[PDB]
Amino acid sequence: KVFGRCELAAAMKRGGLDNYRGYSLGNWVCAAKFESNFNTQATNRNTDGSTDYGILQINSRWWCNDGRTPGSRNLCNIPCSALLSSDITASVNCAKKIVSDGNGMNAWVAWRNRCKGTDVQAWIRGCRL
């Protein structure tokens, strides 16, 4: 499913992401935009053999099991395919663990390079939240 900006903001908010670990909602919507272009089915393979899955491009080396990443830790205890669902709950629950891991949102490279320090408020402007 390809989410709309405001539609995604509402789902993430309902999911408990607004200001989770101090990160406002605009941060999360911005990261999703640049990581997957709001597409739940996005996947991207990395050079180390791991793959990134879903709306927030969660990596198979640490967070989910895809059965083809040797040394995977599956810290979110979930098959990576569950992260591609139209219901973002799994991605949301796993993202909470990732952001709490010590490096905050810097764990998402597109956030660090394209969202961090920008007016992220623009991402939820106009939305009825």
UniProtKB/Swiss-Prot annotation:
Subcellular location field: Secreted
Principal place of residence: secreted
Annotated catalytic residues: 35, 52
Reactions that this protein is recorded to catalyse: Hydrolysis of (1->4)-beta-linkages between N-acetylmuramic acid and N-acetyl-D-glucosamine residues in a peptidoglycan and between N-acetyl-D-glucosamine residues in chitodextrins
Domain C-type lysozyme: 1-129
Expressing tissues: In the egg white and polymorphonuclear leukocytes.
GO cellular component terms attached to this protein's record: cytoplasm; endoplasmic reticulum; extracellular space
Residue sites binding substrate per the record: 101
Cysteine disulfide partners in this protein: 6-127, 30-115, 64-80, 76-94
Keywords (A to Z) from UniProt: Allergen, Antimicrobial, Bacteriolytic enzyme, Disulfide bond, Glycosidase, Hydrolase, Secreted, Signal
EC number annotated for this UniProt entry: 3.2.1.17
Enzyme class: hydrolase
Biological processes per GO annotation: cell wall macromolecule catabolic process; defense response to bacterium; defense response to Gram-negative bacterium; defense response to Gram-positive bacterium; killing of cells of another organism
SMART domains found in the cross-reference section: LYZ1
Entry keyword annotation includes Isomerase: no
SUPFAM superfamilies per record: Lysozyme-like (SSF53955)
GO molecular function, a single term: lysozyme activity
Subunit structure, interactors included: Monomer.
Function description: Lysozymes have primarily a bacteriolytic function; those in tissues and body fluids are associated with the monocyte-macrophage system and enhance the activity of immunoagents. Has bacteriolytic activity against M.luteus.
Protein family according to the UniProt entry: Belongs to the glycosyl hydrolase 22 family.
Note: Lysozyme C is capable of both hydrolysis and transglycosylation; it also shows a slight esterase activity. It acts rapidly on both peptide-substituted and unsubstituted peptidoglycan, and slowly on chitin oligosaccharides.
PANTHER family assigned: LYSOZYME C
Entry protein name: Lysozyme C
Source organism of this protein record: Gallus gallus
Biological classification of the source: Eukaryota, Metazoa, Chordata, Craniata, Vertebrata
